[PDB]
Design an enzyme around this catalytic site. Structure first.
Site: not given
Ligand SMILES: Cc1cc2nc3c(=O)[nH]c(=O)nc-3n(C[C@H](O)[C@H](O)[C@H](O)COP(=O)(O)OP(=O)(O)OC[C@H]3O[C@@H](n4cnc5c(N)ncnc54)[C@H](O)[C@@H]3O)c2cc1C
Ligand SMILES: NC(=O)c1ccc[n+]([C@@H]2O[C@H](COP(=O)([O-])OP(=O)(O)OC[C@H]3O[C@@H](n4cnc5c(N)ncnc54)[C@H](OP(=O)(O)O)[C@@H]3O)[C@@H](O)[C@H]2O)c1
Ligand SMILES: Cc1cc2nc3c(=O)[nH]c(=O)nc-3n(C[C@H](O)[C@H](O)[C@H](O)COP(=O)(O)O)c2cc1C
Length: 601
Positions: A598, A600
């Protein structure tokens, strides 16, 4: 209820190229769409279709169209399984005997090397079709999300078309704006995903198209420190009729930071509060709008469009016409290059610098595109998934989410913030549109089966669920097996998620062993693998004699593969085996549902 043969739809609409897309979070679609838009002024004319609503057996009837070509843009998910929408195609393909001789094809796989079955889906469609008698027109592209899926595609697409032109010898907007001055507001979408007033007239069952609106019951900071912010939300699903189990995922539909939205209107000199519609005008298509219409520009940019992730090549190229300064105009036209400084500038100035649309506009003063064309080029805002952190047997009417709020400073000089996490972060206990999707991450059936949970960081999410259910079975008097939690965090007093709860579980016998690695409390980094290696002999007794199940949740890039290597070692050691012997033993565990992941990124 599927649609009528795409073959007839093609013959009736004058098209010859059809591009299906196996997509989950809309990347394969974005490609399928760009590819079928390439043909249109390259001699031919195509269309991108969702395989979930058509009978792919009709591929045999495809050659009835002269110069016919079918292209598959497939994504692989989980353990090398197809995406939801491509599921029925996969199974048909898997055990059909239909002779597709005459059928021409080309496949582009979307994957990520950090996972084991890299482009397993794409590779399957590719190998399979040929076995059914079809002919490959171009080599199978194998895009990689670990590096840059965008550049892998730009490259394949660059060689694909020239190949299609030689073999076939031909040798050679997408929406209309209709502002609705006079129109009742109860006919305007305010950001639901399905039908009008669906967020208001809520009717079960709820799903991807009809998300339930759960109100935030609780939102607390698990984080004890200050460096980061880790939160715990408790969403109420009282009368949703929703059924979930420990290990399942819950998707959430976020809302872009309004401040970012209003600035895009400002700098672009556009009025966001304009009720309008973008009608796909190729009158004969079932894809009428890019996103729910009629609606305002504001509502679009806020709930329907992606305004944060760095723009892809095609949108930067289209907006290039809107640059008054030639110097900037050329940079936009060059970022589309598959090589050279144009390719260098894209990866640096955009991807790496994490420049979203608004940034690009601020750093390129010439760019003053029309908001309607921007809303057409921009990709759709997807839903973010979260491993449920509760048990349905102790919290049937509540779904818990554990998450770390993303927020960092980019090379763009701007502080970027996670879309969903900032959103959830602000949700004061306030509805949240969510749904739930089943997984294979499940506790064993026989309560007597011992389990080894390895979840460092936010990867402890699903385990709070397993532990609650594991203690619950003990309340029922049932004979529960060993429940071992291998957790990890930076410092005991900075981010020890659920410190108190875990302690309560340990002494109540629920949690057999609370193994925590504090990676930053000493000079050398202590990780959960070290605790695994420490308890090797016992771990082997469970894995080898007790038929224990292993669950690795969390980071996929490093932690997950490091943990694998440790188990390879434990195995290679306690049952005398050479390395290779141990790796097959471990992969055989994944085959029988003994080693579940699980992870990611
Ligand atoms: C099956 C599954 C389960 C998940 N379970 C969880 C969970 O239990 N808990 C949890 O917190 N998340 C979990 N995630 C991750 C979650 O879905 C999101 O990716 C996370 O919450 C961030 O989304 P966001 O919209 O806040 O950020 P977004 O706006 O999507 O931004 C995220 C993106 O920013 C970029 N990034 C981040 N930090 C940096 C940095 N310092 N420098 C450069 N680029 C950077 C990367 O592209 C990252 O993917 C899971 C994902 C999947 C597929
Ligand atoms: O995800 P998130 O945001 O929850 O991350 P996170 O909380 O920072 O990561 C959780 C923990 O895992 C550690 N870690 C980093 N690489 C690891 C690896 N290769 N194997 C095992 N543990 C590792 C981290 O230590 P460090 O962050 O101290 O490396 C930290 O203790
Ligand atoms: C939970 C999850 C599982 C994945 N499993 C695989 C996998 O087994 N193999 C692989 O090559 N890629 C895997 N990937 C990567 C995706 O296929 C890749 O991001 C692709 O670009 C997704 O396209 P989409 O946006 O159309 O879904 C996985 C991604 C996620 C988030």
């Amino acid at each position: 209820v599927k649609e009528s043969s795409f073959v007839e739809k093609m013959k009736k609409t004058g098209r010859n190229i059809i591009v299906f897309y196996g997509s989950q979070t809309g990347t394969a679609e974005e490609f399928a769409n760009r590819l079928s838009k390439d043909a249109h002024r390259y001699g031919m004319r195509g269309m991108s279709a969702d395989p979930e609503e058509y009978d792919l057996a009709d591929l045999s009837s495809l050659p009835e169209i002269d110069k016919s070509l079918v292209v598959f843009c497939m994504a692989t998910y989980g353990e090398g399984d197809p995406t939801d929408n491509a599921q029925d195609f996969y199974d048909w393909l898997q055990e059909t005997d239909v002779d597709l001789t005459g059928v021409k094809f080309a496949v582009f796989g979307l994957g990520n090397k950090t996972y084991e079955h890299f482009n397993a889906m794409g590779k399957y469609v590719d190998q399979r079709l040929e076995q059914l008698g079809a002919q490959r027109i171009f080599e199978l592209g194998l895009g990689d999300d670990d590096g840059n899926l965008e550049e892998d595609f730009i490259t394949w697409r660059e060689q694909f078309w020239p190949a299609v032109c030689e073999f076939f010898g031909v040798e050679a907007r997408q929406y209309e704006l209709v502002v609705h001055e006079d129109m009742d507001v109860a006919k305007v979408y305010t950001g639901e995903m399905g039908r009008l007033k669906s967020y208001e007239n809520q009717k079960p069952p709820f799903d991807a198209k009809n998300p339930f609106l759960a109100a935030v019951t609780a939102n607390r900071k698990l984080n004890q420190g200050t460096e980061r912010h880790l939160m715990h939300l408790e969403l109420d699903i009282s009368d949703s009729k929703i059924r979930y189990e420990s290990g399942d995922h819950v998707a959430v539909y976020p809302a872009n930071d309004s401040a970012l939205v209003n600035q895009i209107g400002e700098i672009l000199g556009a009025d966001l509060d304009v009720i309008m519609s973008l009608n796909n005008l190729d009158e004969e298509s079932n894809k009428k709008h890019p996103f729910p219409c009629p609606t305002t520009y504001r509502t679009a940019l806020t709930y329907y469009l992606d305004i944060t992730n760095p723009p892809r090549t095609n949108v930067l190229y289209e907006l290039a016409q809107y640059a008054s300064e030639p110097s900037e105009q050329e940079h936009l036209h060059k970022m589309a290059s598959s090589s050279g400084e144009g390719k260098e500038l894209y990866l640096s100035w955009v991807v790496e610098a994490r420049r979203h649309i608004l940034a690009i506009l601020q750093d390129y003063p010439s760019l003053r595109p029309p908001i309607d064309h921007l809303c057409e080029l921009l990709p759709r805002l997807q839903a973010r998934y979260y491993s449920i952190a509760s048990s349905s047997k102790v919290h049937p009417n509540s779904v818990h989410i554990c998450a770390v709020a993303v927020e960092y400073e980019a090379k763009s000089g701007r502080v970027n913030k996670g879309v969903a996490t900032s959103w959830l972060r602000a949700k004061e206990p306030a509805l949240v549109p969510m749904f739930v999707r089943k997984s294979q991450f499940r506790l064993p059936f026989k309560s007597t089966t011992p389990v080894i949970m390895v979840g460092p960081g936010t990867g402890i999410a699903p385990f709070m669920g397993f532990i609650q259910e594991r203690a619950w079975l003990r309340e029922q008097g049932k004979e529960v097996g060993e429940t071992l939690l291998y957790y990890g965090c930076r410092r005991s007093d900075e981010d020890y998620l659920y410190r108190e709860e875990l302690a309560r579980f340990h002494k109540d016998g629920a949690l057999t062993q609370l193994n925590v690695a504090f990676s930053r409390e000493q000079a050398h980094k202590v990780y959960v693998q070290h605790l695994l290696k420490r308890d090797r002999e016992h771990l082997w007794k469970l894995i080898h004699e007790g038929g224990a199940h292993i669950y690795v949740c969390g980071d996929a890039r490093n932690m997950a593969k490091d943990v694998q290597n440790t188990f390879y070692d434990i195995v290679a050691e306690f049952g005398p085996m050479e390395h290779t012997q141990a790796v097959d033993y471990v992969k055989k565990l994944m085959t029988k549902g003994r080693y579940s992941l699980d992870v990611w990124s």
